[PDB]
Design a protein around this ligand. Sequence first.
Ligand SMILES: *OP(=O)(O)OCC(C)(C)[C@@H](O)C(=O)NCCC(=O)NCCSC(=O)CCCCCCCCC
Length: 82
Amino acid sequence: AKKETIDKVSDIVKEKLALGADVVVTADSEFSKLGADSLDTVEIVMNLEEEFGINVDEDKAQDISTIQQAADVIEGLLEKKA
Ligand SMILES: *OP(=O)(O)OCC(C)(C)[C@@H](O)C(=O)NCCC(=O)NCCSC(=O)CCCCCCCCC
């Protein structure tokens, strides 16, 4: 995934887990480290699915460990369609 796609996901996540002002997010930052809980984590994918207009199961998003990890998977879905 490019730096642009990462910024979009990071922007939404940091905002979802906090204000994003007092929180630092990186492509190497793990979702668990950010504090993303079960109630939050589900919200992260929910917003991304709506923002990116895609659909992904939580089971598949298991290989996700960092922000970019999800970014790469999402980019793949976009390429699949159209
Ligand atoms: O929701 P919470 O109160 O945290 O409940 C936790 C729970 C008690 C259910 C615990 O037993 C639990 O987590 N069970 C499920 C197994 C588990 O530990 N899952 C961890 C989820 S973390 C995860 O998936 C990290 C990546 C998240 C990616 C989200 C964005 C993906 C976009 C494609």
